[PDB]
Amino acid sequence: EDTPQYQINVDQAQAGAMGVSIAEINNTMRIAWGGSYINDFVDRGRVK
Amino acid sequence: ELGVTAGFNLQLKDSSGQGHEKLIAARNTILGLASQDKRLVGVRPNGQ
């Protein structure tokens, strides 16, 4: 079924007023909330 | 795999992540026992 969702609205005007990049805002949101897979490591001989 | 292979071939496996050193120690023990056996001839490791 269709469900409520939350919408984030980012103001270009205030972002420019504070000297913050749209791309920088997007990256911060993406990592902080969505999470990201960065690279690998080895755990008892197996890459993870 | 057909004309020059009279002898047997086997793969000893490190099933748990015990490291290279334990694996080669086990290989060494196997080879050492096999050297002292009448029915087996010329058993060697097949790698560097």
Side-chain angles (χ1 to χ4, degrees), chain B residues 5 7-12 24 27 31 42-48:
Chain B
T5 36
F8 63 68
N9 198 337
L10 140 151
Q11 306 275 350
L12 171 68
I24 47 136
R27 184 200 58 173
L31 297 166
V43 316
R44 41 158 154 71
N46 183 267
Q48 293 177 335

Side-chain angles (χ1 to χ4, degrees), chain B residues 3-41:
Chain B
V4 75
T5 36
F8 63 68
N9 198 337
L10 140 151
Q11 306 275 350
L12 171 68
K13 336 228 280 176
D14 196 14
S15 315
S16 327
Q18 300 186 29
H20 190 59
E21 268 172 64
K22 303 283 286 181
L23 175 83
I24 47 136
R27 184 200 58 173
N28 292 331
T29 309
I30 291 169
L31 297 166
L33 302 169
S35 192
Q36 301 176 14
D37 178 291
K38 208 71 176 180
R39 42 183 160 168
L40 296 160
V41 181

Side-chain angles (χ1 to χ4, degrees), chain A residues 3-48:
Chain A
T3 77
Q5 307 179 332
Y6 191 67
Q7 181 61 55
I8 290 171
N9 310 320
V10 171
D11 178 16
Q12 314 301 66
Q14 286 152 41
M18 306 301 302
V20 306
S21 171
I22 298 311
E24 206 70 300
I25 298 154
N26 288 332
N27 285 316
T28 305
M29 291 197 290
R30 188 184 52 81
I31 294 169
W33 285 59
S36 197
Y37 160 50
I38 307 297
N39 54 21
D40 282 310
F41 86 111
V42 184
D43 194 69
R44 317 189 303 278
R46 181 170 181 91
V47 295
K48 310 278 186 63

